[PDB]
């Protein structure tokens, strides 16, 4: 998963986030900040149209956010290679989630929203 993580970090940095991959278990794949916003990211790349993220993976994203007094947004960021698009889902609670192209949004749509939330 390292190449996809590097690509995502590069995207986030291009978008003005300070983003870093955390070397590899208890921590998110990537975290990124811009202003008072902290993204806690599970990053996945797939040729399938869906990806399963386990409860404990989501929990790790949330626990990481709980460490900081920033406005946290947990994110499952998936490069859905079969549509050549990074899409994201913001987990609302720690549970098993199947992220699909249909229940995710383009990462650029997220960035558009975050631009408003930071503004």
UniProtKB/Swiss-Prot annotation:
UniProt GO molecular function: DNA binding; endonuclease activity; metal ion binding
UniProt: Mg(2+) binding residues: 5, 29, 42
InterPro entries for this protein: Hjc, Hjc_arc, Restrct_endonuc-II-like, tRNA_endonuc-like_dom_sf
Catalytic activity of the protein: Endonucleolytic cleavage at a junction such as a reciprocal single-stranded crossover between two homologous DNA duplexes (Holliday junction)
EC number: 3.1.21.10
CDD domains: Holliday_junction_resolvase (cd00523)
Gene Ontology biological process terms, A to Z: DNA recombination; DNA repair
Activity over temperature: Optimum temperature is 60 degrees Celsius. Could be higher with a more thermally stable substrate.
Superkingdom of origin organism: Archaea
Keyword presence, Repeat: no
Pfam assignment, any one: Hjc
Cofactor(s) it depends on: Mg(2+)
Co-factor remark: Binds 1 Mg(2+) ion per subunit.
Record site feature (Transition state stabilizer), residues: 44
Keyword DNA damage: yes
Key words of the record: DNA damage, DNA recombination, DNA repair, DNA-binding, Endonuclease, Hydrolase, Magnesium, Metal-binding, Nuclease
Function: A structure-specific endonuclease that resolves Holliday junction (HJ) intermediates during genetic recombination. Acts only on 4-way DNA junctions in a sequence non-specific manner; introduces paired nicks in opposing strands 2 bases 3' of the point of strand exchange only on continuous strands of 4-way junction DNA. Cleaves both mobile and immobile junctions.
Family: Belongs to the Holliday junction resolvase Hjc family. Hje subfamily.
Subunit structure: Homodimer.
Other noteworthy facts: A second Holliday junction resolving enzyme, Hjc, with different substrate specificity exists in this organism.
Name of the protein this chain belongs to: Crossover junction endodeoxyribonuclease Hje
UniProt gene name: hje
